[PDB]
Task: structure prediction
Amino acid sequence: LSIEETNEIREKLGMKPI
Amino acid sequence: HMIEVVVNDRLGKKVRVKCLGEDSVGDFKKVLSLQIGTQPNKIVLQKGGSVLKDHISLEDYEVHDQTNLELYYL
Result:
């Protein structure tokens, strides 16, 4: 999975971005 | 500081998850679950046969870039 789509998932979970 | 962890399932599927060493195992499961279409409470992760606890960080389990974990479904 791309870094960008991973970061989309992270953001939605309330996590810090990569 | 991105690392990519390799998750191996019981049908031989390898799933690569981009994350941070500082992430908790629990939060790693949250990202993995959305990537593969499950929920964290439906899965277990092991490293070398030992179960990973949700409240401990990936890095404390010495999970690094390209580290392999084993995935099991409840």
